[PDB]
């Protein structure tokens, strides 16, 4: 056709790729390593691509959080001769801020030419400010835009409102919506969504009934399932049930594209309400919308079923996931691991722990956290020590460090008080020392008295000055300076 001459089916195979780039980069999987390997193999080749092909590739790589390969492809293909326009420069600015940080994004914006510093680049930098929560520089961009008469779109106002909601100054939203209505700016559905969220955050449930009637009066915005998701979340957190069911049934009517996240929202909202029959009603629709169901829907479903106490249904779902799983997801195991430790059927939890790494799932930290929860409920402390050591050795799955909860630490130390396990208390303190540099809220401030078994340590209040100036209760130093 004359509309689209650069067709991807009829194009030459000697010059161009045999399959589209957004199909080629995802051949070996969606993993970071496989995407990087595919990009490295492609950039060394002698086959070429289209500009719209690279644009859709950038959007697909951005849509799954793959920011480094998207930035690398954009930089290399611009270096090879593909000229960025203003829109492509806005997308590249957002990609730079996503990958190398806002300090790199600011330098890219400065090094941009002057005729490229238009409303698209300004709005992209504003969004990259609000997503990184820098209120002062945000407002410094805002008054500069208002001074230079750059057209402020609804996207910028929604970005500021989401920034206000996340920072905690959520009372500014009702002033700002009337500001953007006074400045002749029509809103979108996300404007009503953040307005509703700020109104519910202001402890005002009765205000969300006058906004829905106003957008019904407007007649210009299309209501979407995200609106009803916000209504369902606000009502379920507020305890109202029938209005939440009406919102969720309207949500089910609005989900015409069979969205996986929307189905997850139905499942978790009906699970938090507690209605098992309609939970299974949406679940059968989910199995009718995707036969090869991913592990995320199982992760939601089995957690909902065990929070609604359907344990043999969860056990049959486990066998279904076993017989149809391609990746042995450890979180699926770890849901019923914590289930079997909470209801105490510990032999089957131990069997799953043994059989997971053979089938191909290595243990993360939360399984050991649930087992030390089990051991701190049943009073065995040595096995809680053996669990917390392996938990801090594994650490977090995103590169963080695992730290035990304050309530569990407090209960474990109260258990240490009775048995006079000074060695156990010292090992727990050493573990917390390795975990964190601070180590103290209630950890040892009133907990010198575990030394009241036989003698005490040497330093006499000088060790307690070492760990960054802690302060103890007034009724704690008396048995300390009695024993000197």
């Amino acid at each position: 056709h004359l509309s689209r001459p650069r067709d991807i089916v009829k194009r030459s195979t000697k010059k161009y790729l045999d399959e589209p780039l957004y199909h080629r980069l995802f051949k070996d999987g969606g993993s970071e390593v496989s995407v990087r390997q595919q990009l490295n193999q492609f950039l060394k080749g002698t086959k070429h691509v289209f500009k719209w092909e690279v644009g859709d590739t950038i959007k697909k790589l951005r849509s799954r959080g793959l920011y480094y390969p998207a930035l690398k492809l954009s930089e290399v293909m611009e270096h090879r001769g593909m000229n960025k326009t203003v829109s492509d420069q806005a997308i590249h600015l957002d990609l730079v801020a996503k990958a190398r940080g806002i300090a790199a994004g600011e330098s890219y914006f400065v090094d941009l030419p002057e005729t490229s510093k238009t409303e698209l680049t300004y709005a992209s930098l504003l969004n990259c400010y609000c997503k990184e929560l820098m209120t002062e520089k945000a407002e410094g961009l805002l008054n500069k835009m208002k001074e230079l008469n750059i057209t402020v779109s609804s996207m910028s106002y929604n970005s500021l409102m989401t920034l206000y909601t996340k920072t905690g100054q959520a009372e500014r939203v009702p002033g700002m919506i009337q500001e953007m209505k006074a400045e002749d700016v029509m809103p979108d559905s996300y404007t009503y969504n953040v307005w509703m969220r700020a109104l519910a955050a202001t402890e005002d449930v009765s205000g969300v009934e006058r906004v829905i009637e106003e957008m019904n009066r407007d007649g210009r915005v299309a209501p979407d399932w995200t609106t009803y998701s916000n209504m369902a979340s606000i009502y379920v957190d507020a305890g109202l049930s029938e209005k939440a069911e009406k919102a969720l049934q309207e949500l089910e009517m609005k989900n015409t594209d069979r969205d996986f996240k929307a189905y997850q929202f139905l499942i978790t909202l009906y699970g938090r309400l507690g209605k098992l029959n309609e939970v299974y009603r949406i679940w059968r629709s989910l199995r009718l919308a995707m036969p090869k169901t991913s592990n995320v829907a199982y992760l939601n479903m089995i957690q909902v079923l065990v929070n609604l106490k359907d344990l043999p249904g969860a056990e049959t779902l486990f066998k279904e996931w076993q017989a149809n799983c391609s990746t042995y997801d450890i979180r699926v195991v770890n849901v019923m691991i914590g289930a079997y430790t909470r209801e105490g059927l510990v032999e089957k939890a131990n069997e799953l722990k043994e059989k997971s790494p053979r089938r191909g799932g290595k243990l993360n930290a939360k399984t050991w956290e649930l087992f030390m929860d089990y051991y701190v409920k049943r009073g065995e402390t040595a096995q809680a020590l053996e669990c917390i050591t392996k938990a801090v050795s594994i650490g977090k799955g995103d590169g963080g460090k695992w730290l035990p909860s304050e309530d569990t630490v407090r209960a474990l130390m109260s258990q240490f008080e009775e048995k006079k396990d000074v060695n156990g208390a010292e090992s727990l303190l050493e573990i917390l020392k390795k975990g964190t540099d601070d180590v103290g809220a209630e950890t040892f401030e009133s907990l010198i008295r575990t030394y009241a078994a036989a003698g005490k340590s040497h330093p006499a209040m000088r060790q307690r000055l070492k760990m960054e100036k802690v302060k103890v209760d007034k009724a704690t130093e008396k048995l300390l300076d009695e024993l000197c």
Binding site: L276, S285, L288, P291
Partner: protein, 205 residues
């Protein structure tokens, strides 16, 4: 154990593509209803508990390999309906008498199931094939005669509690050119026939 229990799952989406997708999963569509819905008169079409079902492939095939194919419409089962697969909660329960399977003539895979509720005291018509026992010991068969299979099924009308899954006769006492009528067939005295028996046997040598 005496009778079989059939676990079922409800249905809400009906159609050819949805049925083929349920069979892609391995679930077979089905229905359950009382008999009063099947009457021609809407006056006798009363309060009908018509309901849609889906059935597990492994359980249906296990029952079929257990009991046999053409005897399926005679025997009764206990239907248990639950909200989800393997749920600890039940919706309803009862006894049912099947009348219809759907199977493709190529591979024989089960395609549809038709189920009729069989509550206490319900009078239902049924077509039961008969079973001949004592073949190897029949003196007419041993001496040179042959047992001609005349009639296959008989019509029975009676309670849901006491319908036999199979009809047995004794043919070990027949010499050659001997026949046994349908009135000599061992069956329940409270059970009625509604069949044109007349001067016809079930078997003859």
């Amino acid at each position: 154990h005496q009778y079989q229990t059939i676990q079922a799952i409800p249905r809400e989406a009906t159609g050819r593509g949805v049925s083929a997708r349920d069979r892609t999963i391995g679930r077979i569509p089905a229905v359950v209803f009382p008999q009063s819905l099947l009457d021609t008169d809407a006056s006798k079409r009363g309060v009908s508990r018509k309901q849609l079902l889906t059935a597990d492939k492994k359980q249906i095939k296990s029952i079929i390999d257990s009991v046999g194919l053409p005897f399926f419409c005679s025997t009764t089962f206990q239907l248990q309906i639950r909200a989800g697969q393997g749920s600890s909660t039940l919706v309803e329960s009862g006894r049912v008498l099947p009348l219809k399977v759907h199977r493709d003539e190529e591979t024989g895979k089960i395609l549809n199931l038709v189920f009729v509720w069989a509550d206490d005291g319900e009078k239902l018509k049924v077509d039961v094939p008969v079973v001949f026992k004592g073949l190897d010991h029949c003196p007419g068969l041993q001496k040179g005669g042959n047992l001609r299979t005349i009639r296959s099924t008989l019509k029975l009308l009676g309670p849901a509690e006491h319908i036999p899954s199979k009809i047995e006769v004794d043919v070990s006492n027949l010499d050659i050119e001997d026949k046994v009528l349908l009135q000599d067939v061992v069956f329940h005295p409270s059970l009625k026939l509604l069949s044109k028996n007349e001067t016809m046997p079930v078997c003859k040598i």
